[PDB]
Amino acid sequence: ALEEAPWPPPEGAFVGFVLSRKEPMWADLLALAAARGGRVHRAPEPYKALRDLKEARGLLAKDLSVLALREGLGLPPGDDPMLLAYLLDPSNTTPEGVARRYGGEWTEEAGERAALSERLFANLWGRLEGEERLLWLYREVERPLSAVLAHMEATGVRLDVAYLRALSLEVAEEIARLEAEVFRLAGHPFNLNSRDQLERVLFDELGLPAIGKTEKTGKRSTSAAVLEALREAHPIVEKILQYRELTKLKSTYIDPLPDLIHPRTGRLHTRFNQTATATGRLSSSDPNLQNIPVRTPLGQRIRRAFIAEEGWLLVALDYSQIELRVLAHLSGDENLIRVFQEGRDIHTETASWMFGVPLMRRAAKTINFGVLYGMSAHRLSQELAIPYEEAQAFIERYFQSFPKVRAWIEKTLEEGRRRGYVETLFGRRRYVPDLEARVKSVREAAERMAFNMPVQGTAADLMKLAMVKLFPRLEEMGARMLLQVHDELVLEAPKERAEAVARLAKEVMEGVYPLAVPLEVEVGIGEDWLSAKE
Template structure:
């Protein structure tokens, strides 16, 4: 016997709200929120994929009042207006539904629940089984032997048995229960003081709402009966409000809601616009607007063909170049092949180092590079790349030096959307070309079986490598006009592109490390760790694995009964992170010792033991990478290894910095912007007190302390100055009273009073903050003095904590971002002067506001003068920029 056909009715209005609030903030490349669309899409794909439905409809509430509003004017009056971030997503949700072939039903003056009720009862009568896709308990009154409810977000199915388990009664009595308990979400009043639990018990006991409200039926306790009689009209009204109308006039047949074939071409367009990479990949080539047949990718193994292609590059005046190599480390990578493109849709791959059985004869690397050298060094030819710095370093090692205009698609994508985490070529091509590129792992494999690119067969290598160069060029053609349109072209051409070779040279220089210093310190730390272990075991009363969070938690919370704080991310156990350990240190010394143990252990593994292993044998130096596309504020970051995170204020950090040394006979020079963010705050805010303090060369923290504590500067104590310093820098980061209280060890009330006094004295700063937040709410973004832009997506979030974080970000970004732009500009000018004057000094490190140089004998004074001139004069602000310069035999001595 065949099963009766099923009809799926999706509660669209309910799901779009649930998806919006259940999923963390998602945005596309333009910063438009997309989480509701994403969650809704997951739901319909799950239904279509798992259930293979024949009949399906999505039902939405239509705008305007319904009969319920006529019965009760306060119906749903408690609901806030739909968030703007959700409003903009609804058209996409409906369009995607149509593209999947899902009929959409909505009717003026009728709620989606009533449409669902009408269709469900009609289908039941016509012999169909019905699956209502929703999590709304209002719809449970419809459940019957042929009607079920499926909550896809919780993957729960509600049938007659489930209703009985939850309410202890049949579905038809749910409206009686809600007549008593009301429904807060729809502002249905019910009877005051009666919740769902009491309502269920009353209906179970007396059978119906009418019986409960019957004056002749005794209900205990008597006071409850009095309340029921007092609010009996309200209870009956509430029952009417929650009872679904299953007789809405509808002129549709079941064929009208038959699932139709999807429209993959339109889906691809929408997914590309929304940045849904996962769904685009699952679409595959269906609906792909870029047909493979329109792309001309060739492998070049004949000299004449390569010469002809290079002539085309020179004529076009642009070159997209991508290297395939043996390593992601540009200081060690060997070239396997070169990809070239100068027009969209066409590219070549020149293999020079493929080494596998049966590999074809390839052109010699030195001959290929000699031919390319003239073009790469031609200032009239624009050089295009994805992460250009990588190719810059490798070709520089081979004696080829980039000249002329540069365009890095990774950096262009980053400037357009700095909050995005990834700016790889595959993602950029999806965003701007609507194309899915071949992934690297599809060519070489992954894990232990991954091939070196030199082992990849040439046919596969051509398809992958030529595509990289051509797609990069195609992205450049899309991104260039967008940068101009968004007012970002000047920042791109004036700062970010000129910075690429500066950072490349810094990375190539590297830093010299005294491995013996770190080895000695590592042994010392190892001894201290063993002593700490024994102290921890003694305090805990037993031996255990200190590195196991689970075992540590058992000691702290079960054995020692210390206060339990926040839970881990999975909510499975209580956290033992650094913040928790610091709190627990107030209750038991073992927590402090564990914190010390972890800190030392991390120091040993991250720096003392790891850094010497990263010294490149060829150079004898450490080569970090400086990243332009990681932080949302525009600051540079450092990786492989991260040299910006070495502790500054601790003795251990100082000991590590002692290992960073210059060449024999040379010295290190440090140039550090003094209080640059506070000076930028003074410029932005034009606060009279702040500006005057900097113009007069005062100690700004002592000045603030004097203002806060209402005393002469001479009377300011070190502790008063310390507190003022915390507030000065805390204001930049939007620090709350709670945060300040934690930092200073005072009450929240005292902290708020201190913040209030600060703003009373620095009213210009208050005005700057208020105006910045107003602009962020109006435009959805903030900018630096150089027009670097950061979208502040959550500035209007209904979630208070999320909104406050967004507000702190809005306050800080223009200041921190401007500081980042200033030092980048200074780096460009210093590098240019060093090369113009043929000096031996080299810039080797940047740590936020600090630059470190390695200086040969006899150049120190000249370099210091040059640094001060450039860094202090890089831009004219309303207050002077000040640079502190120091010199020493190692990095620690520079502080």
């Protein structure tokens, strides 16, 4: 810092850069700087100076690296103080917060940013000393991962624009039809997009019972859950739910996506955020490609839009019940571990209401998804369509079949209260203080956040590690990693190597880290994201 010294910087310096916007793929490089040995180096011309650097180290290294790859420059990201802070406390998600917290100030000048990166790393890195397990995550997962992610953000994914443009016109017509029908029943036109106007119409201008109310402002809710219960109580309801689906997918996916194709690449680029979640998961944004619809017919039509480059094929890899398996391993429950040991499908195997294996099943498929979150009979009976206590009775059979689960939940909650945090299999930790709150609702909310983190975070660790190990193997085969959706990966491979890439990636993922239970991966190849599954 302080002493201004001419560019270029000495090797191994901390970089501070300024972008016109957050998205590195769309951002103009306004300023570039570096700091080292107590010196500040401000580049005369940012874009040119980019060539000098050998690797990116400093706050938000990956982003600068992404922009570098955009310009043909092979500039890999390295140390990033944000990554260290994220490992100390996953609540450290922003440079504004991190700086303020560890001896600095997040500015709009590259030099002060570069200097902030230098001292911020010194301090933070010191706080990580002794934390063997965290250091291991930083070196063996986080740091290397930042590079893999940088290459995914720069590669982007191919989108069938004309297809979506056409789908938009068809959906527009169907929306108009539902709009006219709803207005007819309402006896008058209003903003069907306005849940406020909808509330008045539904519960006041109609004999419709208000089931629940909104959290913050306490209005009569018009959530899908509420409307579901009223689907028979009125024709207009079903038409409103259908209107909801269409408008949701049209305004969020169908319309905005085509307009996001990058001019240089001709592909769709998302940002994979590394210090965003409280559990250790990745997040996707601008645009979010981890929530592309798939569960409904209309959603699946949208998913077909994501296609492979010509001469290429999409390879889709999904872990199967990875969080359940993580639980089986974390808890040590034999009667569960031995369900994945025998390769026996849990949902039907845990369909032990009587004996499989084989009738009421899928009621367990929702119990298994449900135990991870700590859902009670209410969310259960409602989503399963059964009496309130024809749901409670269920949940208790579960803890009797799998006692070691309850024991683990109990275990970690106790651990959490004591030291103030919980952790994953690899020692990634999340601080959750409200475990000692005197208000039950608040405390029981903290508890759910608390015992879910180790499970969801461990699965995140496994996927991350699997990506770090899988990446180099893909480069050697001229294949590329496109997207990650928490428990699934999407690769793009040349048709010829497609099947080879598929088999390899599968094994890299199944053996990423052996547990007291085998990890199972489903693999699919196709010209589009949808067909690449099944």
